[PDB]
């Protein structure tokens, strides 16, 4: 059960558009993170 508190929405009112950007930290672990300018794949060196 890892999809309960993930189906979300920004519950504020002062928020811009957020995109479903996949991120990789260092070890090939892609996670959707709400991020601007749809990069699609991220990687930290």
């Amino acid at each position: 059960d890892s999809s309960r508190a993930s189906l979300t929405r920004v519950h504020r009112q002062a928020y811009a558009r957020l995109y479903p950007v996949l991120l990789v930290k260092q070890d090939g672990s892609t996670i959707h993170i709400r991020y601007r300018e749809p990069r699609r794949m991220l990687a930290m060196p």
Binding site: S2, S3, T8, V10, H11, I31, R34
Partner: protein, 116 residues
């Protein structure tokens, strides 16, 4: 009135506690105050998962002291929330922690660190 059988029928301040270490005495064992940090790069996963932990604790009748949040770190921003918890039974430590373990949505890490 004092000499009547109905004395004290209107008193109410004994119904209100109008007013931290760990208590492990001999049989009734419980933790002290707790802290649950939540770090994520989404506002939604940290806030909403903090809501889900908080509703679990209200559904388990746990004294939840604070539910605040911490400032972020420009690295992107690392988002944190703190949930305080006091009161756990012996089985209730395992049964309580196993659902927070088995309920992490996406890439959010925990803490069962303590005060100060």
């Amino acid at each position: 009135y004092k000499t009547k059988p109905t004395h004290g029928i209107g008193k109410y301040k004994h119904l209100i506690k109008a007013e931290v270490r760990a208590i492990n005495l001999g049989t009734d064992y419980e933790y002290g105050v707790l802290n649950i940090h939540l770090t994520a790069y989404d506002m939604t996963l940290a806030e909403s998962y903090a809501q889900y932990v908080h509703n679990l604790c209200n559904s388990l009748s746990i004294k939840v002291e604070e539910s605040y949040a911490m400032p972020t770190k420009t690295i992107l921003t690392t988002h944190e929330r703190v949930v305080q918890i006091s009161g756990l039974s012996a089985t209730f430590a395992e049964i309580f922690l196993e659902i927070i373990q088995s309920s992490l949505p996406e890439g959010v890490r925990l803490s069962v660190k303590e005060h100060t």
